[PDB]
Amino acid sequence: KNQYQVEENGLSFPLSLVDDSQLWALASWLEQLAEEDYLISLTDRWLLSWEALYRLLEDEEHASSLPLIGVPDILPLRASLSSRGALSDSDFRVWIAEWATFPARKPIRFSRTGAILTHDNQQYLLSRENWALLQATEQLSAQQIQTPGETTNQLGWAAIRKCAKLAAAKFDDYLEKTHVIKPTSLSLRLRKATVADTAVIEIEPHFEDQPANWLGSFDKNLQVHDSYRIPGENGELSHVIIPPEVKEVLNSIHSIPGRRVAGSEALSFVRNPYTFLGEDAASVIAPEEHEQALFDARIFFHHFRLIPQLNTENKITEVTLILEPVSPVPQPEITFVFSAPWELDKFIQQLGISVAAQMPAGSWQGYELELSQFTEQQWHDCQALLTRWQQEIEAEPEIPLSLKEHIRLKDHQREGVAWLQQLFLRSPEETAGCLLADDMGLGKTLQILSFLVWFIEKFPQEPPNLIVAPVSLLDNWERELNNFFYTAGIPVLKLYGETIKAVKYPKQAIPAHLQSKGIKNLLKPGWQGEAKIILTTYETLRDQEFSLARQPWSIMVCDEAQKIKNPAALITHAANAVQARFKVACTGTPVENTLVDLWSLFDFAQPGLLGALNEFGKQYVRPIETERLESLRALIEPQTLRRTKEEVARDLPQKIEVESCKQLTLSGVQKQLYLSSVANWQQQQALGMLGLLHRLKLICAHPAIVNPEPRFRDNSPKLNWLLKILAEIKHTSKDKVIIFTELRDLQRELQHAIHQNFGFRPVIINGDSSTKSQSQNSRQRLIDDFQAQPGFGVIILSTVAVGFGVNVQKANHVIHFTRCWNPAKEDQATDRAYRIGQTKNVYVYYPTVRDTEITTFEETLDDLLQRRRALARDMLCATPDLNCADFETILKG
């Protein structure tokens, strides 16, 4: 008996399945899907739409839960499209009347309601691609009965052709030879070429499915048309429809004469096209693909330095030029020798041209130059060097007054603020920036805001401050500033969303010379206004690099500085391009993969402290990846402030790790199941590791999931221990309990067990995603209902959290029924009850099933996580997730 009703929009589940007792698992899974935004409530029933159904089928976290509803198996089907008339004709119809099995190519006829079929009284499911193809044909049919014309025909046929290439469909004679393409994204092919003494860069647009002759037509035409008509060699007629955004990008590409990148303007467009185009270009051109294209074409914008070699009497006819690259991997530098004044004069002339163009990119002898950090001061130093050569030829912190009286800084927050100020008072001369590497939960936001507001009051005539962070964290910064300080004297500009579009030029209002430079995105003069703090996103930092880098800044705070850990990323180039008196890098993990991350962070904060990337790599990266580690620590200590939670544990009350839960024993049947698991896996290997580790994790956690046999339901040591401790907590102290586990089926089993032995169903939440959404509002409301009800209560949560903001302090019991493979993520999950607002002691449980003859998966996982956490207490250590090679000790025993 299927529990769903097939209809025209998806699968239908009644809201009354929760009231049913024998379908607890199905109702719980429907609640999980509703919480995870897979089901839609229609005031009488849930709807699992076809797009949601296919996304769910491809979702692996719910793979074990799918048998609960029993979606019909996908029938392998191939459609052949038929058409009548031509696209110019108003009667042009594209339809599917043919459906053949994939192996046998046997035509079939079937009934259909939505994406579910009916062949020989048996229900099947259309493929995602076949469903998309059918939707495309039906949408064309609907559009033709609403607005006939060739434009509707072309758009519909482009959609149908795309879906049919994805669906591997067949076309009739007319549609095989008729081609209609509407590209929504562009690929920029970049190559270094030489046509004269100086090299040039060739830029080439590309489509997903581009006609062979489209580039010639694109080049020969004077402008970029909304639609291109390219004839093929076989008489095939190909139509290319250019959307407005793709048209804008192709306009900028086409404005380059000959598609040859020469000069500061075109090189600056290649360096970062998103300032010249805007925020709409990111959809057309993927930033990561542009980064990769720059890397493949060996287009590196080198920093340059000039060093005279003083003679005996300080006389000079000698100069060198050193180009240290901006690359993701350290590379040897490129050296020039300026033995004569005229060649240096030519280099200064190139620099002049680049500066007068107000562009951050230059070129010299086929090498690109990075001139965003090239200030006017260094320009005058170069010019003065030229002229001189030629003439030779012939504590306690200061608390801001706007801080609200009901808000007090912790001690460690006070020293953090004081350290920030003491670095700042020597900022323009000695300390270009700093790094806050504190752990999350210590309140970086309040210390940074106190430092910023102190600067704003004490120095009211200085240029504004900039904070760069993800969007949700930007809302977090705004909210915390409004909570802690009197904002009346602190105007704030939120350069994201509607507000940035408010302060942006219309594309036709940009000055004439800036449009001649190719700049199609710009902010109006005075966009800052009276604001003293401007909040912006890293994507906005990349998209508005030109406007943000024109203005002066006092303090630039890059929250979550691991976004700029890649030296060659365009976001990193935008962060470095902005010129600020003081630059604060705020991240809990300065080093994620390599020490190059720390090098990038300090090149952002204090340029030149760690030297060039190549020497840093050959001195600190290659021979460790310790005396060198301690030397690097001493080098970065004055500029780095790191405090961990165990250092500031005086304010965080007694996080206790319970040891009794860690000595649980395998049941006999669980143990035999684990040994059989290992034996079968080894046997199949003789005749993959993720599956073995996952199934061992399941056996350790809940044997009944692996095998529903009677033996495993009552012989789960973790479940018995959980029920026993929850009984104890309910009887003695009546606290609230958090169980952390990421397995949906285990979540349902634990929920059913807690309901059976305690009379209430714990709430399950898995999909905390950003904020400002109804689903997130519903999850937050569920958290509030859990926390508000006085007395004993249990909530089942997943350790996954894409962003901070969701809090459970009313519970002080953190049971990790199943543990993550990353100690940082597990500590993050734990620090949802063990936070600054926690009153009672936090009891953290790590139920580990032990055995006296075999080292089980949980014992090995516990040891691995303990060692990785011990390493992670170090800042200079990169701590990735655990992999299979870490668990290879299971195989021997």
Residues of 178-194 as b/e, b for ≥16 C-beta within 10 angstroms? bbbbbbebbbbebeeee
Rounded to an integer, what distance in angstroms lies between the CA atom of residue 416 and that of residue 396? 10
CA-based Rg of the chain, rounded to a whole angstrom? 32
Sign of CA dihedral 483, 488, 494, 499: positive
CB atoms within 10 A of CB 709: 11
Q: How many residues make up the chain in this entry?
A: 893
Cα–chain center distance at 433 = 26
Longest CA span, the chain: 101
List, edge to edge, every strand of the sheet that includes 178-181.
Answer: 178-181, 237-241, 227-231
Rounded to an integer, what distance in angstroms lies between the CA atom of residue 243 and that of residue 215? 17
Method: cryo-EM
Cα–chain center distance at 415 = 32
Q: What is the resolution of this structure in A?
A: 2.7
Strands 199-206 and 260-261: antiparallel
- The amino acid at 815: I
Q: Where are the beta strands (DSSP E) in 417-491?
A: 433-436, 465-468
Q: Where are the beta strands (DSSP E) in 389-513?
A: 433-436, 465-468, 492-495
3-state secondary structure of 50: helix
What are the tokens at 828? 């993050």
* Cβ 270 vs Cβ 294: under 8 Å: yes
Rounded to an integer, what distance in angstroms lies between the CA atom of residue 229 and that of residue 238? 6
- CA–CA distances in Å: residue 611 to residues 587, 603, 618: 21, 8, 11
Rounded to an integer, what distance in angstroms lies between the CA atom of residue 652 and that of residue 645? 8
CB atoms within 10 A of CB 649: 11
User: To which residue do tokens 């199934």 refer?
Assistant: 695
Angle at 281 between CA 280 and CA 282, to 5 degrees: 95
* Cβ 876 vs Cβ 632: under 8 Å: yes
DSSP string, 215-227: HHHHHHSSS--SE
Rounded to an integer, what distance in angstroms lies between the CA atom of residue 324 and that of residue 140? 56
Classify the phi-psi angles of 232: left when phi > 0, otherwise alpha if psi is within -120 to 50, otherwise beta. Answer: beta
* Cβ 837 vs Cβ 831: under 8 Å: no
Rounded to an integer, what distance in angstroms lies between the CA atom of residue 345 and that of residue 330? 30
Exposed, middle or buried, 385 (CB in 10 Å: 0-12/13-18/19+)?
Answer: middle
Please, which residues bridge with residue 738 across strands?
795, 814
- The amino acid at 49: S
* Cβ 150 vs Cβ 169: under 8 Å: no
Among candidate residues 773, 805, 810, the one with its CA nearest the CA of residue 795: 810
Residue partners of 260: CB distance under 8 A and separation at least 6: 193, 195, 200, 201, 202, 203, 266
CB atoms within 10 A of CB 234: 8
* Cβ 882 vs Cβ 821: under 8 Å: yes
Among candidate residues 670, 559, 849, 775, the one with its CA nearest the CA of residue 35: 775
Rounded to an integer, what distance in angstroms lies between the CA atom of residue 858 and that of residue 864? 10
Rounded to an integer, what distance in angstroms lies between the CA atom of residue 457 and that of residue 439? 28
Rounded to an integer, what distance in angstroms lies between the CA atom of residue 736 and that of residue 472? 28
Rounded to an integer, what distance in angstroms lies between the CA atom of residue 295 and that of residue 289? 10
Rounded to an integer, what distance in angstroms lies between the CA atom of residue 571 and that of residue 566? 9
Q: Where are the beta strands (DSSP E) in 376-507?
A: 433-436, 465-468, 492-495
* Cβ 740 vs Cβ 798: under 8 Å: yes
* Cβ 448 vs Cβ 413: under 8 Å: no
- DSSP classification of residue 887: G
Domains parsed from the chain with CATH numbers? 5-68 (no CATH), 77-163 (no CATH), 187-296 (no CATH), 413-641 (3.40.50.10810), 655-892 (3.40.50.300)
Q: Where are the alpha helices (DSSP H) in 578-707?
A: 596-605, 613-616, 627-636, 668-686, 689-701, 703-706
Rounded to an integer, what distance in angstroms lies between the CA atom of residue 45 and that of residue 12? 7
Residue 381 CA neighbour count, 13 Å, CB half:
9
Give, for 350, the enclosing helix (H) or strand (E).
helix 341-356
Among candidate residues 573, 514, 509, the one with its CA nearest the CA of residue 543: 573
Cα–chain center distance at 636 = 28
Phi, psi torsion values for 766, nearest 5 degrees: -130, -15
